[PDB]
Amino acid sequence: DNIQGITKPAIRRLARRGGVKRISGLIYEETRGVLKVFLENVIRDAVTYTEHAKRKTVTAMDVVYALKRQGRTLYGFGG
């Protein structure tokens, strides 16, 4: 329901930093299903750290470990 909030003009801007000139309209659809799959994977694991600390607030340090888990290390928040 909130999936869209990632607007067609938002995707456009990512791809333009991604070095893209011309974009099929079929892609805006595609990008959402990809982005969703990425946040699922990362979130899921990130909460798994929260639920093992037994907190109910998810922390920067919970995401950092879950990204570092997924191969995606994030310099900037704790570390």
């Binding site: 909130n2 990632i6 333009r16 070095g19 969703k36 998810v58």
Partner: protein, 98 residues
């Protein structure tokens, strides 16, 4: 009666947006899409605005990176218009999907 040629502004937006470092997804519509999915693993959850920020950074950065490869897969097909089959391919090779 001035008009630009289909592409010569996209290239201006490219030039511009690489040069800059600000988050190209709006911060609320994301922060909701953080909460929405998160409730599927456990309900009644909070988030440090930093840990929202953490996810936007990594998700924007991820897709930036994926668009580059998908761009490369579409050039490789004698194209400049990227397509879904150019994402599908760049993940297949990335070993994200089968």
């Amino acid at each position: 009666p001035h008009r630009y040629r289909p592409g010569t502004v996209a290239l201006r937006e490219i030039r511009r947006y690489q040069k800059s470092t600000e988050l190209l997804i709006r911060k609320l519509p994301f922060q909701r899409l953080v909460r929405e999915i998160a409730q599927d693993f456990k309900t009644d959850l909070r988030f440090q605005s930093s840990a929202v920020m953490a996810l936007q950074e990594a998700c924007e950065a991820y897709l930036v990176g994926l668009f580059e490869d998908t761009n490369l897969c579409a050039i490789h097909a004698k194209r400049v218009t990227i397509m879904p089959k150019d994402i599908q391919l760049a993940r297949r090779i990335r070993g994200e999907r089968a």
